[PDB]
Amino acid sequence: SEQLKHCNGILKELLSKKHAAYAWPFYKPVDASALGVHDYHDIIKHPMDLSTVKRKMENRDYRDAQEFAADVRLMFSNCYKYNPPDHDVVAMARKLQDVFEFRYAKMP
């Protein structure tokens, strides 16, 4: 699909070395305990990350571009939900989200 093809194109860019300085926290699912937090899944009922998005895209589980956008945004939303507005990871999330939001808008 031309939209989903566009989305796959966005996913690839989000995973580029190009944005690796602020994207790396979003490459894989949050491992709370490992990071020293034990309340993350109390707060966050629906974890999401880029590898899972890439998985679903490979299984063609996305009915359209909107479902894709919803997951990517959920990933960012989870990060802003759990963390304080001044946290570094949050700043990393806004930088990557600006790449996503800008490419998503340029879709046919």
Ligand X SMILES: CC[C@@H](C(=O)OC)[C@@H]1N=C(c2ccc(Cl)cc2)c2cc(OC)ccc2-n2c(C)nnc21
Which residues of the shown chain bind ligand X in the complex (CB under 6 A)? 25-26, 30, 32, 35-37, 40, 79, 82-83, 88-89, 92
The CB density around residue 23, as the number of other CB atoms within 10 Å, is 21
**Least CB distance to ligand X at residue 2 (A):** 30
Cβ proximity to ligand X: between 4 and 70 the closer is: 70
Q: Shortest distance, CB of residue 14 to ligand X, whole angstroms?
A: 13
φ, ψ of residue 106 to 5 degrees: the values are -85, 10
